[PDB]
Structures are given as C-alpha cells and as structure tokens.
Enzyme design. Structure first.
Site, PDB file in Angstrom:
ATOM      1  N   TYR A   1      85.552  34.311 -13.828  1.00  0.00           N
ATOM      2  CA  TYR A   1      85.386  33.039 -13.139  1.00  0.00           C
ATOM      3  C   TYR A   1      85.813  31.855 -14.026  1.00  0.00           C
ATOM      4  O   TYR A   1      86.576  30.965 -13.612  1.00  0.00           O
ATOM      5  CB  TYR A   1      83.915  32.905 -12.713  1.00  0.00           C
ATOM      6  CG  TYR A   1      83.526  31.489 -12.412  1.00  0.00           C
ATOM      7  CD1 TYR A   1      82.732  30.762 -13.295  1.00  0.00           C
ATOM      8  CD2 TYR A   1      83.941  30.861 -11.239  1.00  0.00           C
ATOM      9  CE1 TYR A   1      82.367  29.450 -13.003  1.00  0.00           C
ATOM     10  CE2 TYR A   1      83.571  29.554 -10.923  1.00  0.00           C
ATOM     11  CZ  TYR A   1      82.785  28.832 -11.823  1.00  0.00           C
ATOM     12  OH  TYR A   1      82.374  27.539 -11.559  1.00  0.00           O
TER      13      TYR A   1
ATOM     14  N   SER B   1      84.384  23.416 -14.784  1.00  0.00           N
ATOM     15  CA  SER B   1      83.103  23.944 -15.196  1.00  0.00           C
ATOM     16  C   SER B   1      82.959  24.054 -16.714  1.00  0.00           C
ATOM     17  O   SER B   1      83.971  24.206 -17.417  1.00  0.00           O
ATOM     18  CB  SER B   1      83.099  25.348 -14.662  1.00  0.00           C
ATOM     19  OG  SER B   1      82.164  26.141 -15.394  1.00  0.00           O
TER      20      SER B   1
ATOM     21  N   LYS C   1      88.829  29.052 -13.654  1.00  0.00           N
ATOM     22  CA  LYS C   1      88.714  27.593 -13.733  1.00  0.00           C
ATOM     23  C   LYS C   1      89.655  26.985 -14.791  1.00  0.00           C
ATOM     24  O   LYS C   1      90.301  25.954 -14.598  1.00  0.00           O
ATOM     25  CB  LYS C   1      87.266  27.158 -13.981  1.00  0.00           C
ATOM     26  CG  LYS C   1      86.355  27.358 -12.761  1.00  0.00           C
ATOM     27  CD  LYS C   1      86.777  26.544 -11.557  1.00  0.00           C
ATOM     28  CE  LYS C   1      85.643  26.440 -10.517  1.00  0.00           C
ATOM     29  NZ  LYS C   1      86.005  25.570  -9.375  1.00  0.00           N
TER      30      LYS C   1
HETATM   31  N1  LIG Z   1      76.650  25.312  -8.917  1.00  0.00           N
HETATM   32  C1  LIG Z   1      77.056  25.164 -10.201  1.00  0.00           C
HETATM   33  O1  LIG Z   1      76.257  25.280 -11.118  1.00  0.00           O
HETATM   34  C2  LIG Z   1      78.504  24.793 -10.522  1.00  0.00           C
HETATM   35  C3  LIG Z   1      79.504  24.743  -9.566  1.00  0.00           C
HETATM   36  N2  LIG Z   1      80.794  24.607 -10.035  1.00  0.00           N
HETATM   37  C4  LIG Z   1      81.842  24.595  -8.994  1.00  0.00           C
HETATM   38  O2  LIG Z   1      81.583  23.613  -8.044  1.00  0.00           O
HETATM   39  C5  LIG Z   1      82.089  24.045  -6.733  1.00  0.00           C
HETATM   40  C6  LIG Z   1      80.976  23.925  -5.700  1.00  0.00           C
HETATM   41  O3  LIG Z   1      79.879  24.704  -6.200  1.00  0.00           O
HETATM   42  P1  LIG Z   1      78.540  24.900  -5.334  1.00  0.00           P
HETATM   43  O4  LIG Z   1      78.440  23.799  -4.362  1.00  0.00           O
HETATM   44  O5  LIG Z   1      77.390  25.047  -6.238  1.00  0.00           O
HETATM   45  O6  LIG Z   1      78.786  26.326  -4.580  1.00  0.00           O
HETATM   46  P2  LIG Z   1      78.808  26.677  -3.053  1.00  0.00           P
HETATM   47  O7  LIG Z   1      79.036  28.131  -2.912  1.00  0.00           O
HETATM   48  O8  LIG Z   1      77.571  26.121  -2.376  1.00  0.00           O
HETATM   49  O9  LIG Z   1      80.041  25.813  -2.521  1.00  0.00           O
HETATM   50  C7  LIG Z   1      81.373  26.336  -2.384  1.00  0.00           C
HETATM   51  C8  LIG Z   1      81.708  26.165  -0.928  1.00  0.00           C
HETATM   52  O10 LIG Z   1      83.048  26.679  -0.743  1.00  0.00           O
HETATM   53  C9  LIG Z   1      83.142  27.372   0.449  1.00  0.00           C
HETATM   54  N3  LIG Z   1      84.259  28.269   0.305  1.00  0.00           N
HETATM   55  C10 LIG Z   1      84.368  29.378  -0.472  1.00  0.00           C
HETATM   56  N4  LIG Z   1      85.567  29.977  -0.381  1.00  0.00           N
HETATM   57  C11 LIG Z   1      86.257  29.172   0.508  1.00  0.00           C
HETATM   58  C12 LIG Z   1      87.567  29.288   1.051  1.00  0.00           C
HETATM   59  N5  LIG Z   1      88.444  30.258   0.762  1.00  0.00           N
HETATM   60  N6  LIG Z   1      87.931  28.330   1.921  1.00  0.00           N
HETATM   61  C13 LIG Z   1      87.030  27.348   2.269  1.00  0.00           C
HETATM   62  N7  LIG Z   1      85.799  27.161   1.825  1.00  0.00           N
HETATM   63  C14 LIG Z   1      85.465  28.130   0.955  1.00  0.00           C
HETATM   64  C15 LIG Z   1      81.797  28.087   0.529  1.00  0.00           C
HETATM   65  O11 LIG Z   1      81.510  28.522   1.885  1.00  0.00           O
HETATM   66  C16 LIG Z   1      80.815  26.987   0.040  1.00  0.00           C
HETATM   67  O12 LIG Z   1      80.279  26.173   1.096  1.00  0.00           O
HETATM   68  C17 LIG Z   1      82.741  25.402  -6.940  1.00  0.00           C
HETATM   69  O13 LIG Z   1      84.158  25.311  -7.179  1.00  0.00           O
HETATM   70  C18 LIG Z   1      82.001  25.880  -8.207  1.00  0.00           C
HETATM   71  O14 LIG Z   1      82.784  26.868  -8.915  1.00  0.00           O
HETATM   72  C19 LIG Z   1      81.161  24.452 -11.389  1.00  0.00           C
HETATM   73  C20 LIG Z   1      80.106  24.247 -12.214  1.00  0.00           C
HETATM   74  C21 LIG Z   1      78.742  24.203 -11.818  1.00  0.00           C
HETATM   75  O1  LIG Z   2      68.345  35.550 -11.524  1.00  0.00           O
HETATM   76  C1  LIG Z   2      68.702  34.944 -12.523  1.00  0.00           C
HETATM   77  C2  LIG Z   2      69.744  33.972 -12.589  1.00  0.00           C
HETATM   78  C3  LIG Z   2      70.061  33.390 -13.732  1.00  0.00           C
HETATM   79  N1  LIG Z   2      69.402  33.678 -14.909  1.00  0.00           N
HETATM   80  C4  LIG Z   2      69.758  32.931 -16.137  1.00  0.00           C
HETATM   81  O2  LIG Z   2      69.623  31.568 -15.888  1.00  0.00           O
HETATM   82  C5  LIG Z   2      70.679  30.826 -16.584  1.00  0.00           C
HETATM   83  C6  LIG Z   2      71.497  30.061 -15.582  1.00  0.00           C
HETATM   84  O3  LIG Z   2      72.157  31.043 -14.783  1.00  0.00           O
HETATM   85  P1  LIG Z   2      72.990  30.570 -13.512  1.00  0.00           P
HETATM   86  O4  LIG Z   2      72.255  29.665 -12.615  1.00  0.00           O
HETATM   87  O5  LIG Z   2      73.610  31.744 -12.846  1.00  0.00           O
HETATM   88  O6  LIG Z   2      74.125  29.571 -14.148  1.00  0.00           O
HETATM   89  P2  LIG Z   2      75.350  29.847 -15.101  1.00  0.00           P
HETATM   90  O7  LIG Z   2      75.672  31.271 -15.207  1.00  0.00           O
HETATM   91  O8  LIG Z   2      74.980  29.158 -16.377  1.00  0.00           O
HETATM   92  O9  LIG Z   2      76.633  29.125 -14.386  1.00  0.00           O
HETATM   93  C7  LIG Z   2      76.427  28.005 -13.581  1.00  0.00           C
HETATM   94  O10 LIG Z   2      76.864  26.861 -14.352  1.00  0.00           O
HETATM   95  C8  LIG Z   2      78.234  26.971 -14.792  1.00  0.00           C
HETATM   96  C9  LIG Z   2      78.493  25.683 -15.547  1.00  0.00           C
HETATM   97  O11 LIG Z   2      77.594  25.718 -16.686  1.00  0.00           O
HETATM   98  C10 LIG Z   2      79.199  27.155 -13.615  1.00  0.00           C
HETATM   99  O12 LIG Z   2      80.492  27.461 -14.151  1.00  0.00           O
HETATM  100  C11 LIG Z   2      78.730  28.303 -12.732  1.00  0.00           C
HETATM  101  O13 LIG Z   2      79.562  28.325 -11.561  1.00  0.00           O
HETATM  102  C12 LIG Z   2      77.290  28.124 -12.311  1.00  0.00           C
HETATM  103  O14 LIG Z   2      76.974  29.245 -11.458  1.00  0.00           O
HETATM  104  C13 LIG Z   2      71.468  31.835 -17.406  1.00  0.00           C
HETATM  105  O15 LIG Z   2      71.026  31.862 -18.774  1.00  0.00           O
HETATM  106  C14 LIG Z   2      71.179  33.148 -16.640  1.00  0.00           C
HETATM  107  O16 LIG Z   2      71.256  34.326 -17.491  1.00  0.00           O
HETATM  108  C15 LIG Z   2      68.377  34.624 -14.960  1.00  0.00           C
HETATM  109  O17 LIG Z   2      67.762  34.925 -15.992  1.00  0.00           O
HETATM  110  N2  LIG Z   2      68.076  35.201 -13.754  1.00  0.00           N
END
Ligand SMILES: NC(=O)C1=CN([C@@H]2O[C@H](COP(=O)(O)OP(=O)(O)OC[C@H]3O[C@@H](n4cnc5c(N)ncnc54)[C@H](O)[C@@H]3O)[C@@H](O)[C@H]2O)C=CC1
Ligand SMILES: O=c1ccn([C@@H]2O[C@H](COP(=O)(O)OP(=O)(O)O[C@H]3O[C@H](CO)[C@@H](O)[C@H](O)[C@H]3O)[C@@H](O)[C@H]2O)c(=O)[nH]1
Ligand SMILES: NC(=O)C1=CN([C@@H]2O[C@H](COP(=O)(O)OP(=O)(O)OC[C@H]3O[C@@H](n4cnc5c(N)ncnc54)[C@H](O)[C@@H]3O)[C@@H](O)[C@H]2O)C=CC1
Ligand SMILES: O=c1ccn([C@@H]2O[C@H](COP(=O)(O)OP(=O)(O)O[C@H]3O[C@H](CO)[C@@H](O)[C@H](O)[C@H]3O)[C@@H](O)[C@H]2O)c(=O)[nH]1
Ligand SMILES: C[N+](C)(C)C
Ligand SMILES: C[N+](C)(C)C
Ligand SMILES: C[N+](C)(C)C
Ligand SMILES: [Mg+2]
Ligand SMILES: [Mg+2]
Lengths: 345, 346
Positions: free
Chosen positions: A156, A131, A160
């Site tokens: 978090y 991330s 990572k």
């Molecule tokens: N959404 C974002 O902006 C970002 C996501 N990431 C990373 O990408 C990955 C996927 O993120 P998303 O798809 O957005 O989130 P998400 O919450 O939709 O996906 C994570 C999945 O992992 C499963 N999970 C959680 N704990 C588990 C466990 N102990 N065993 C098995 N499954 C488990 C959850 O049920 C979920 O389906 C995560 O590692 C997250 O930290 C990093 C940067 C950006």
């Molecule tokens: O209800 C809300 C949610 C978010 N924000 C703002 O919107 C932006 C984006 O927030 P959010 O969607 O929570 O993303 P991040 O905190 O930037 O982190 C996301 O993007 C990262 C990579 O940039 C990953 O590490 C994280 O897992 C992922 O959740 C930020 O400035 C927050 O302060 C608000 O003002 N209100």
C-alpha cells in the site's frame, strides 16, 4: 471553472471533507463506488445525505468507479471542474501485504486513469491523499518532509509513493500543473454532530473503529497486533489527528493550488504520538466502557512508531491541527453511541 | 510440451529473437503484439515472426492485440493453456518518457498490472519479465551486482521498470505459489546470425548501435556522440553490450528456473565487459568495412558514465552466460543492416 471533484467522497475522510467544502462555499461533485462505504437509502450514500442535512446544501453525487474511463469522461463532459481532491483507493497496510495486485490496481491504475482524464480535460489542479507510509521505516522521528521516501514496508505504502513519483514527473513535464500531495498521518474522531463517522464495510482494519465497535459491544475484544516494538509500552505508536482538522487542511490545499504552487508536499499530523494501549485507555475513559483486548502477533507491514513534524503545513498552508485526544475520543464515542451499527444494517 | 508460453511484445526486437529460441528449444509460443513498435507483415504475422517461421521451419501462433485490452486478454487466457508468460510488451523511448510520463505509466504499469491480474485469474503464476539495468539508478559501484540498490531512477521509463519489479516482488512475497524471474538486461545488440531479423527502429534510432549501423549504410549522415568528458578511459560513455541471441537464450534459462518453483528470482543479463562509444565505432568500422563519421555533441540528459554487469549470479543460479563477443555482435548487426537497408518490409 468552479466545481471541485471529490473521488471516494462517501468514505471516512472524504465525507468530512465534502462537509467542510460545502461549509466554505465550495461546490463539490462526489464520486464513489461504495467499495468501503455504506449505500444510502436514496440516490445519496448515507454519509452524504447526512452531510447534505447538516450543511443545508445539496451534494452532487454520482456512483462510479475511477477505473471506468467511460464514466469519467462523461463526468468531465458534464461538469467544469476547477480542481480534483483524490481520496478514492484501498488503504489497509496489512491487507496490502496479502493482496498487492488489488492495491496496485485500484491505487495505481485508478489514479493513472484519473490523471489522464484530468490532463485531457485541462483540469490540472490536484489534491492527493498521500500517506505517512511513504516514509517507510522511520529513520528519525518526528518525520519531516525531508525524510527519505520509498523503501516502503508494504504494497500500500509503495502504491502511494509510486503515485507521488508519477505526479512529480507529470508536474515536471508540464509546469502548468499544480498538485498538493498531503501525507496524512492517522485520522480519528468524527464530526462534532455525531451524525457521521468512520463506518467501514465489513470488519474494521483500523484501530479506532475497531476499538469503538468493541466499546459499543459490536465486537468481543480488540486484537492488539504485537507488543514487542521499540516503544514505551511495546505497542505501535501513531500520530492521531482529528478527521475534522484533516478535512480542513484540504481547504488550505485548495488555496495553495490557486497560487500556482507547482508540486508541493505537506504532512498533515499533530506531532503527538499515542500507543495502541493509550488509545484503548482514552476510549475506555470517553465511553465509560471496558475495552477488552488480547495481544496477538505483529501485523505485517507495520512500523513500531510514526508521528509527524507538521511545521511545513503550518508555515506554507497556514494550517494546524487544533483538536486533541480527548476531543477525538469524545467525538468518536458520540458517533458510535448514536450509531451502534454505523450507517445501517 | 502441450502447454503454451505466452510472449507479449513478441514481434519486437528482443521478443522476436526469443520466439525463435523458444521454437528451437521445443516450446510452443503464442505471441501477442499491437504493432506499436513492430512492422506489419504482408499477411497476418508481423514480418519478424514470418521470418522466424522460415528460419525454424516451425509455427508461431499470433494474435494482434493490446495488453491494455482486458477483453482480448481474458479471451486469450480462455483460448489457450499457458504454462508461463514472458513479458516484453511496453514503451521504451526514454526521451519521450520524460515528456509523456503518463503514456509510460499507462502502458507499462497498467499494462503489466492487467496482465498479472488475468494471469492470476486463470491460475497462471509463472512469469519472466523484461527488466533493465536502469533500475540500479546512477551506479554507486561497478560492476553492478543484483544487490546494488534499486530505485532512484531518473526518468519515467526507468521508474516504470523499477515499479514493476517492486510489484512483482510484492506479489511473490505475498504468494509463495508464484514464480517470477526478473531479467535486468544491459545493452542488447546484434542480430540473429542469418541476418534475416534484427532491430528495426521506427524512425530515428535513440540507441547507439542502430544509429551506428545506419551511419555505416549511409542512412544517416554522421553519428552524434553524447559527450566525451566522462570519467572513462576515452571520456565517452561505457556500456555492457550483449548479443540479442545470448539475451534470448537467457529467457529459455529463465523458463527452466521457473520449473524449479523458484519464487522471485532476479538476474542481470550482461557480459561483464563494458565498451566505450568510440570503441563501438571502431568495432563497427572493422565489421562493416565502412566509414562511420562522428561528431562529439553535448551529453544526453540522464546518461551515466559507465554501466556494466557482474554476471556471476546469473552464471551460478540462472545457469546462463553470454557466449558471443564484441566482434560477433558487430558482425551480426552489420549483416542484418546490409541485407535489410530499410529494415523490414518485403
Ligand atoms: N484513514 C487513514 O488513516 C488514512 C487514509 N489515507 C488515504 O486517504 C484516502 C481516504 O481514506 P479513508 O477515508 O480513511 O478510507 P475510505 O475507505 O473510507 O475511503 C475511500 C473511499 O474510496 C472509495 N473507493 C474505493 N475504491 C474506489 C474506486 N475504484 N472507485 C471509486 N471509489 C472508490 C471507497 O468506497 C471509500 O468510500 C485513501 O486514499 C487512503 O489511502 C492516507 C492516510 C491516512
Ligand atoms: O485491530 C487492530 C488494528 C490496528 N492495530 C494497531 O493500531 C495501530 C494503528 O493501526 P491502523 O489504524 O491500521 O493504522 P496504520 O496501519 O498506522 O495506517 C493508517 O495510517 C496510515 C498513515 O499513518 C495510512 O497510510 C493508512 O492508510 C491508515 O490505515 C498500529 O500500530 C496497528 O498495529 C491493532 O493493534 N489492532
Ligand atoms: N532494447 C533494450 O536495450 C532494452 C529493452 N528492455 C525492455 O525489453 C523489452 C523489449 O525491448 P525491445 O525488444 O528492444 O523493444 P521493442 O519495442 O522492439 O519490443 C516491444 C514490443 O512491445 C510491443 N508493444 C508495445 N506496447 C504494447 C501494448 N500495449 N500491447 C502489446 N504489445 C505492445 C511493441 O509493438 C513491440 O513489438 C521492453 O519491455 C523493453 O523496455 C530493457 C532493457 C534494454
Ligand atoms: O546516438 C547516440 C546514442 C547513444 N550514444 C551513447 O551510447 C551509449 C549507449 O546509449 P544507448 O544505446 O541509448 O543505451 P543506454 O542509454 O545505455 O540504454 C539502453 O540500456 C538500458 C540498460 O543499460 C535500458 O534501460 C535501455 O532501455 C536501453 O535503451 C551512451 O553512453 C550514449 O551516450 C551516443 O553517443 N549517441
Ligand atoms: C531512529 N528510530 C529508528 C528510533 C526512529
Ligand atoms: C523440450 N521442452 C519440454 C523443455 C520444451
Ligand atoms: C535450471 N538450472 C539448474 C540450470 C538453474
Ligand atoms: Mg506471507
Ligand atoms: Mg576514418
């Protein structure tokens, strides 16, 4: 020799990636414990059943927790994996500040357990969900891979970064390992079909799903976390990238592993940053709805701005994020409107 | 004093000495250890602990278990009421760490995370942790004060200690009800004055002192000195050797600090004085009356030229200082070695 294990594959990014993998001829096996994903009617989670339907290909799936050594061993005995794409984990910056142990547990301990199984089974090809938070408070922008890592602003991000370090050590110890660490930025949007999207369990922690839930009427108004940052409008700035583009980057990562690349790190972003208010605006525009909001205090762990220098990924992975804001917003709204309550209720 | 103090890895070197100090200071320890790097007694207790019982005339409650065993840990916390936990358990072979990183991450990281989670679940939020001067990475200045930057560790072992500190710091920042004292040990040496307990390395010692004492006694042919071309007075590595008894006492100070609902506190446990390898060799010849032949070999991977503490914060805030000097450390080490040529057993 052939299967690709996808942990946390029923989630947001994972589901989209399973889709891309299938479309590309790969054979994924997915695992998820549903901590942050909706459980489907049948054996398959809703998201995956939908991917199975959109691609026309079967989704092999098993409900399991990466923290269960037993189940993992079983899974590895049952399938012959060629690689692992690791998405499973907790991902909220603000929550991490308040519940650090949950983050260290699921993210650190869970990954360690997975790496141990992998090592044991001789499956030494990994794609890890890293991330932009590993860069901590940006010292310069855009962020390139050469920017310092560590000194994270929240548990978090530390989790990572610590994983990246463990992986580097593992790769140093055994040159046979190949690992692609993908530092994603802020994925948004949804599959063009509008059949799958971001459907958090509970109240959304992320901006966009929250914003979409406001426009659809599920939530009264968006709470803007601070407006006193050193940004153009005072609200946080992030590099939004279409989840579809991000998913595709995983295929490029798989190819890189086949070159026996060793340990490699790439940012996956667009290079264009957008503020909180700009996103709300783009969404009002896409949805035709009014997205009421109010400004509250800053959320702990948040940085003012962050966006990527995606050149390295273009150069070495031959990947670039094609889609823009309009497309992201349009795709997001399509999914929301077709699924006002997400996958179910 | 009815509540107990849990001591993980208490059968080990620093842990056994600490258990003795806790007993003498009136605390009620409950020790756990898996025998990974501790010698099995003739009976149930580890030899080290059996001896501590005889030296103090006090009892030590002990349970053989692994910190990685959630079931046993959960039962433990149900069985006893703990007021605090002193966490010594872990893997510490630096060299092996570079080769078996996951073992280090599993035991040290996962083990600690489990322990913290169980502690939390049972409402136990008072901790003392075995940290190390290695978390400072290669020194940017000397002496090393707590404010010197941390991280940038060069081996998995060191990185694991740094990661644990960060986790604990995060836990404390999140929850103001947690109190935790992180103790950055420098180079523990010496042994209890009775000569009854001490460091019992399993196999070839990786640290300087036991290697030196083993040479003196004839268990090793000669000492290998790792480089003599460092930017030090004599070119050999310089370290802040600190008596294990003083170090043990620092843990009693830590418990007292916890009693203050101190939140997260971090203190170096050093003397403030560094000594070179050659200087330790001479001091050991003086203490033992034996010849300690050496040969200068290549530098050992990851070694720094000099590392020593700034002991001021510990004196002022932890209310602790190392009272024992170089000669006492060597004398005590020698007595232990001489009286127990093969370490523990019968
Ligand atoms: N959404 C974002 O902006 C970002 C996501 N990431 C990373 O990408 C990955 C996927 O993120 P998303 O798809 O957005 O989130 P998400 O919450 O939709 O996906 C994570 C999945 O992992 C499963 N999970 C959680 N704990 C588990 C466990 N102990 N065993 C098995 N499954 C488990 C959850 O049920 C979920 O389906 C995560 O590692 C997250 O930290 C990093 C940067 C950006
Ligand atoms: O209800 C809300 C949610 C978010 N924000 C703002 O919107 C932006 C984006 O927030 P959010 O969607 O929570 O993303 P991040 O905190 O930037 O982190 C996301 O993007 C990262 C990579 O940039 C990953 O590490 C994280 O897992 C992922 O959740 C930020 O400035 C927050 O302060 C608000 O003002 N209100
Ligand atoms: N001796 C030194 O120079 C330094 C030690 N430290 C740290 O201080 C602590 C104690 O060090 P020492 O007494 O010298 O080492 P040690 O090896 O004698 O003591 C550690 C004890 O932990 C036990 N143990 C290991 N893994 C375990 C597990 N999974 N469950 C239960 N018990 C387990 C071992 O059997 C041993 O008795 C360690 O955390 C070490 O990393 C830090 C700085 C310097
Ligand atoms: O056979 C040997 C062993 C050591 N040395 C030298 O002696 C010094 C001390 O080495 P050693 O006893 O291995 O201690 P350190 O490497 O300084 O590390 C100790 O102290 C650290 C904190 O200072 C902790 O992190 C470690 O766990 C602990 O083992 C160094 O200059 C070594 O190069 C030799 O010349 N020959
Ligand atoms: C230099 N920066 C802190 C504005 C990124
Ligand atoms: C004597 N004590 C109550 C401080 C343990
Ligand atoms: C407990 N203390 C006052 C000695 C710090
Ligand atoms: Mg707070
Ligand atoms: Mg001589």
């Amino acid at each position: 020799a052939e299967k690709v294990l996808v942990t946390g594959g029923a989630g947001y990014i994972g589901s989209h990636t399973v889709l891309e993998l299938l479309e590309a001829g790969y054979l994924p096996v997915v695992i998820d414990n549903f901590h942050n994903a909706f459980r489907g009617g049948g054996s398959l989670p809703e998201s995956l059943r939908r991917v199975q339907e959109l691609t026309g290909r079967s989704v092999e799936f098993e409900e399991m927790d990466i923290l269960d050594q037993g189940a993992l061993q079983r899974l590895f005995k049952k399938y012959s994996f060629m690689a692992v794409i690791h998405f499973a984990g907790l991902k909220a910056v603000g929550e991490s500040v308040q519940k650090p142990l949950d983050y260290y547990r699921v993210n650190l301990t869970g990954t360690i357990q997975l790496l141990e199984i992998m090592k044991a089974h001789g499956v030494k090809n990994l794609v890890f969900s890293s991330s932009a938070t590993v860069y901590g408070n940006p010292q310069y922008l855009p962020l390139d891979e050469a920017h310092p890592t560590g000194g994270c602003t929240n548990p978090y991000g530390k989790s990572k970064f610590f994983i990246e370090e463990m992986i580097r050590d593992l790769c140093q110890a055994d040159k046979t390992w190949n690992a692609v660490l993908l530092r994603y930025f802020n994925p948004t949007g949804a599959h063009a079909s509008g059949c799958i999207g971001e459907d958090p369990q509970g109240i959304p922690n992320n901006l966009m799903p929250y914003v979409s839930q406001v426009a659809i009427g599920r939530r009264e108004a968006l709470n803007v976390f601070g407006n006193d940052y050193d940004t153009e409008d005072g609200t946080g700035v992030r590099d939004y990238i279409h989840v579809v583009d991000l998913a595709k980057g995983h295929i490029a990562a798989l190819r890189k592993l086949k070159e026996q690349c060793g340990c490699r790190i790439y940012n996956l972003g667009t290079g264009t940053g957008y503020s909180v208010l700009q996103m709300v605006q783009a969404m009002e525009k896409a949805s035709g709805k009014k997205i009421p909001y109010k400004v509250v205090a800053r959320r702990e762990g948040d940085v003012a701005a962050c966006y990527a220098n995606p050149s390295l990924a273009q150069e070495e992975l031959g990947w670039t994020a094609a889609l823009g804001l309009d497309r992201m917003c349009e795709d997001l709204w399509r999914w929301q409107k077709q699924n006002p309550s997400g996958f179910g209720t």
